C-alpha cells in the first residue's frame, strides 16, 4: 500500500518509465515512407557475403583473399581448402556480415548456408568432393577418408553453384566444430587457348532462422 | 532472345533487381507547392565505354552528376531548383568464352568518402567531374587532394566484401553478361537540389582479374546505360487568386 | 543449448540503451568564464561504441531522453539550472546574460538530494529523418563544407549553478546519459572496419581485411 | 509502480500540471461578448498591410517610403522597382504585419499575395510588365528578358489593382528567393491639365493559409 | 521542407509561457527595514519581451499562476512566508505588524529542500477583462492621471523569512515566474516599433520605419 518501498527511488539506467516532454505544443514532421525499412538486425545477417577463405601467412595484396586458387597442374588427390565452421571466432568468418551481427550477442545457434561458386573460364570441366565432418569428428586427412563421410560430388561442367545448408552451428564459448573440406577428384581440364588458372568464391548466410540472446558489446572497435 | 526496349533510342538486350522492392513513382501518388512532371526525360543516355584491362582495380560514377551534361536532363538541372528522379541502369559487357572474370555491379546510396590524408579537405573535382569513371587504385593514396581510393576498404572504410547489402548484381563472365538494377529515389526530404547532393554512387568492382589466354582481345568493353525514370520537378508559374 | 527463437534483435531494443556520452566539471568561482558553466552540443559521435551501432543505418528517426547525474563537493541546498537551447536559439556566451532568462528554452531547476533530472526532447528537424551520412556540399557552388547538413543538427544543453549575489567556492561534476526511444531505421549499411580518426569526418587509414593463418589447408 | 521515479521532482518551467487555487470561494465576473475575438496570430497576418517598397539610401522624409514614383518622362524600357520575396529577412517586408508575425517563429512556409494599386490621376493610361522569376532564377536585366518569363501586362487604364498570388515562400535559414520586378512598357500618358507624376502603392498578405512551427523570441526590441 | 499545417499559433499557447519577471534579495538582519522583506506589485510591463507579446491585444482575460524559486546562503531548516495581498488589502510597512497576521491574505509557508512553492491567482477584477490600453483620465474634470485605471490592478506579493525571537544573519534571493492560463484575447493591435522608455507610459521618440538600401531597382 506504499510507493516508498525499498528499491523505488533510484536511477536504474534501463528504466522503461515515461518522462515529461521537454517542449510540448510542438508538431513533429510526420514520417515518410522511405524504401527499405529495417525491423531486425537478423535481416542484415540473412544477406549473402563474400567470405575471405584464402588468407595465407604471406599475402601480397588484400584482394586475393577472396580467391581460392585452382590450377591445371596439381595431383589428383590434393586438398583445395579447409574451413572450420564457427562463424564467431574463426578468422575467416570473423569480419563477414554474419560475423559482425553475431559478435553483438553472447548466445546464438541455428544453421548457416555456404554457396560455392566457380568463377572461371566457360570451357573448364572437372569434379570436386566437398566433404562435411560432423561436430565431434576429426577433419579427413586423405580424399579416401573424406569420401566415406558426407560428400557431394560437385560437377564444375554441369553446375557452377553448390549450396550447402549446414546444421549444428552454436556459440561454443579445443572446441567441437564441424569442418568443410574440398578435394580434387579429376583436376581442371581445359581445351587450347584457355587460361591455366581459375578461382572459387565462397558465400555465407544465416539461413532460414537464427536466434540471438543477450546483448554484449563488440570486441572490435576499441573505445 | 532479344526484347528490344524503345523509348526514343533503342537498346537491344536479353534479371531485374529492384532497389528494395520499390519501383520509381511520382510523388503525386501518396497551389502552395505545385510540381511539373517532365515525361520527355526518359531515354537511354549511354555513357562512355571503359576498358576492362588485366591490370585494373575498379571504377565509380557519382549520380546524378554523371548525367549533368546529358541533353534535356542536364538542362533541367540548371533551370529548375528541386527535382527527384529514379534510374534504370543497364551495365553490359561483351566477352567471349575464353575470357574469365567476375564483376560486382553495386549501387551504393549516400557514400561519404574520406580524404587520402586524414584531416584534410579535397575539392569537388576529386569525386565527380561530368561523366568520368574515377579509378580505385591498389594500395594507399598519398596525394593530398585525392579521395582515399583503396580498393579493399572501398574508399569508405567498410570492407569490400560486405558491399553485398546494397542492391547488387554479379556479372560472372562464365554464364551471364548483363546486370539491370532499378534504383528508386531514396532520400529523407521529398525533393532536393541536384547539384548539392550526390544521391548514390554506382561502383563496378572486378573481384576476379581478367585472364584472356593468348592472342585474344586484351580488354572487355563495359558499357553503362542510364535511363532516368519518373522525374518530377517544381512548377515555375504562379497560382490562381 | 537448444534452439527456440529471438526478439532481442529488433531495432528498437538494439539501439535503445542508456549510455554515458559526456562528463565535464565546472567551478563556480575562478578567473575563466569558460569554466563557470558547461556547454555541450548534442551529438552521438563522441562515444565510439554507440557511434558504431547507430552507423549501421543511414536514416534514423527517434526521440531521445536525457538524464543528468550531478554531484558537488566543497552547506545549504544547491540548485542547478539545466537549460536546453533548441536549434536556432540564443546561446549564453557568459554566465548571467539575457540568454539564460529566455523563456523559449526549456529549463529544469533541480536541487540536490532528489531523484535525477530528466526530460524527453521530441523529434526536432524539418526533415523526415536524421541522416547519419550525407554525400554533398553546403552550397551548390560546391566549395563549402563537405559531408555536413543542418537538418541533423540538435540543440545544446547548458548547465549552470543557480547562485546568489556571491557564489560559494563549490565545484560540481555532471554526467549525461542518452537513450533513443521509439527508434525506426531505414536503409542498412555495412559495419565499420577502421578506427575513427575524427568525430565528424569519415576519414580512415587502410587496414587489412582479416587476420592471417599459416596455410589455406591448415585449420586447427 | 512508483512516482519517485527519476525525473519527477523538479520545476520544468513548461509544466502543464494543475496547481492549487490561491483563493477559492470567490466568484469571477463572467465573460462578456466583446467584438473581435481572436483565435490565432495567423488571423493578424492575413490582413493586408502597406509595404514600404521605396526606401532609397537618402530618404528626406519617412512618408515617401510607401510611394513608388512613376513619371511622364522616362524611357520606354526602364525598370520601375525590384523586390526579393523573402518576407522575414528582406528589409522591405521586415516590419510589415506579415513580417512581425513570422519573426516569432523559426520555421514557416506557404504563399503570400501582392496587390499593386495605382493611386494617381483618373485620366492617366499606360501599361506595365509585372514579371516574376522562379526561386532559382536570376532577376531579368532587360525588359525583353523579363517578358520571356512569367509576366502580366497590367493595363492602368482598364484596371487599377493587380493581384499576384506567389507560391514557394519558405524560411531559407546567397539565398534562393523569387523576384518581382516591374518594367515600363508604354510610359504614362496624360491629357492637358493633369500632374506629371503618380505613384503605385503595394500590399502584402499571408494568403489562404500559412503554417508556423516552433516559437522563438523576436530579434527586434531588445531586453 | 514541406507544407502541412499549424496549431502553435493559437492565442493560448502563444502568450502562455513561464518567464522570469522579478528577482530581488533580502537580508534578515541589517539597519534598513526596507531590505528585510520583498515587495512586488504584480504587473507585466517590466520584462520587455513579455510586454511586447501581450500588447498585441487590447483586452485580455486570464488567470495566472506564480511559482517562486528561493535560495539562501549564510544551519537548520528555514521557512518562508509568501503572502499575497489582493487589491484593497492591508499592506505591511515593516517586518512584523498586524498586516502579516491578516487572515484574508492567502499565505504559503514553504520550507527549503522541497519542490518550489506555487499558487494560482484567479481572475480578479470587477471588469470583464483587463485592458492594456486606456485612453482616459481618472476623474471627469480630466486633470488627474492619464492612461491609468484601477480595473487592471493586481495585488502585491510580500515575502518574508519566518524567524524566531532573534533572526540568523542569512540572506536569501527570490525569483518569480509568471504564466497566464486559459488566455482569451479580443481586439488585435499593431506591434510596437519603438523602444520603451517608461514602464507605465506609452512614451517614445520617433524612429525610421525601416532600413534603407542603395536604390529601388537594386536588390541582391
Residue numbers in the entry:
A (entry chain C), D (entry chain C): 3 to 175, 184 to 233
B (entry chain B): 14 to 27, 30 to 45, 50 to 260
C (entry chain A), E (entry chain A): 54 to 127, 137 to 282
How did the manuscript describe this experimental structure?
Its positive-sense single-stranded RNA genome is ~7,500 bases long and encodes 4 structural proteins (VP1 to 4) and 7 nonstructural proteins (2A to C and 3A to D). During cell entry, enterovirus capsids undergo conformational changes leading to expansion, formation of large pores, externalization of VP1 N termini, and loss of the lipid factor from VP1.
This indicated that 0.01% faf-BSA in DPBS efficiently converted CVA9 into expanded particles and only a small fraction of virions dissociated, releasing their vRNA. Compared to the intact virions, the two cryo-EM reconstructions of CVA9 virions treated in two different ways, 0.01% faf-BSA or ion composition, yielded RNA-containing A-particles expanded by approximately 4% in diameter. In addition, these reconstructions revealed more flexibility in capsid proteins and no density for the lipid factor. The MS results indicated that there were only nonstoichiometric amounts of VP4 present and no VP4 could be modeled into the reconstructions. Further comparison of the two expanded particle reconstructions showed subtle differences between them. The CVA9 treatment with albumin induced expansion in the majority of the particles exposing the VP1 N termini in about 30 min, whereas most of the particles still contained vRNA. When virions were treated with faf-BSA, the lipid factor was bound more strongly by the albumin than by the capsid, causing the capsid to expand.
